[PDB]
Amino acid sequence: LVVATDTAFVPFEFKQGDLYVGFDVDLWAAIAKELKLDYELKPMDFSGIIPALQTKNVDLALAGITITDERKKAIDFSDGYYKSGLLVMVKANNNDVKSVKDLDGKVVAVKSGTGSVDYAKANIKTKDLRQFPNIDNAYMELGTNRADAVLHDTPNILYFIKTAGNGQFKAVGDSLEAQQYGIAFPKGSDELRDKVNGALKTLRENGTYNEIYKKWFGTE
Amino acid sequence: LVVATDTAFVPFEFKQGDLYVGFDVDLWAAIAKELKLDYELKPMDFSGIIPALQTKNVDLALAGITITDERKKAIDFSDGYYKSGLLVMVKANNNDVKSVKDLDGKVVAVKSGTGSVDYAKANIKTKDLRQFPNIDNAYMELGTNRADAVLHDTPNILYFIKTAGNGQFKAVGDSLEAQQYGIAFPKGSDELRDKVNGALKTLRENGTYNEIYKKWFGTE
């Protein structure tokens, strides 16, 4: 089996010295061993991934791919293996928030041009809603005390808190507007899809999914 | 179904490489096969379990949970699947034999602040009740014929005898002050609890209980 991934989608897959590492990279390996499957990893630009799948130049793919409906026209997915969505981040040493942040005097920093803007325009009465060109900017805003909270995606904030905000920040609530990631197969791959799904169940039931999730995201 | 356990309660559940293993984990896996349930395992700190049961944040739990009336107030319990209580452990080459640690025999090692303190005190009339910060101090006191025997709980006795007390040690009687472990459900879960009780019968009748028991505790 030839399985394709992104060239970098931290922390799901990214080079490390000479190998690749990440949540997707550890997840597939555990599924593969449950099934006794031999395979080969082939890194390539996301843009080439549904293409190469549809011509069967590649047998499956795990590149943090979201199960959407327009995508199901083109391919098939396994069961969801990851809950993504939007997440709230505030100062760790702040005990006054949990998606309760509007007309008390509340300021949310976001990145321009993502689902975080939208959701906040609709579901929050921010005293202020600041938009930045990059999230890094948003972080430095929370860094000082101009932003009450940041709103961005689950994996990005979770992993940030683990590596670089270690110390100072904390996330609250859980995923808003949650969607799911899925393993992509070419159509007509019904048997294998069924086999992978089956193995995904086993990994949840014996606790291997949980520990892999801890390692990279640091919570449950 | 989301199924929770303790983060470490040996040998009922604990982390073996990248999964979890133990008596609870195997007995539940077998009950889930009978009824064909899909489930996710989710280790957590013990004292976060009943709270999460009560909010239906979790559907059921196994974590070596003693059935107490104090607890029935808050949650509901299945038919109970593990008989616990105290056990005398003496040297192998020895002829004490029940709780006959009395009259002229008897120097009894036991840990501070524990059922065995109080059971010996009131019951056994002996030379000594030597008490210790930890039982490891009691295993050591018995190694060298300074103590005649030890009082401690059924599974810690059985498991130590199977792993580290290999051969030199042995156990005598069976459980004193018996109490049962139960699988925990949040109330208003009548249908599922009566299903889980049923599958426990099937496993006791066909021999599977007995064979899971022998695996972890080297006896019946």
Swiss-Prot record, chains A, B:
PROSITE patterns: SBP_BACTERIAL_3. Pfam families: SBP_bac_3. It is found in: Periplasm. GO terms for molecular function: ligand-gated monoatomic ion channel activity. SMART domains: PBPb (SM00062), PBPe (SM00079). Induction: By lack of glutamine. One of its GO terms (biological process) is amino acid transport. It comes from the Bacteria. One of its GO terms (cellular component) is outer membrane-bounded periplasmic space. Keywords: Amino-acid transport, Periplasm, Signal, Transport. Belongs to the bacterial solute-binding protein 3 family. Involved in a glutamine-transport system GlnHPQ. This is Glutamine-binding periplasmic protein. It comes from Escherichia coli O157:H7. The gene is glnH.
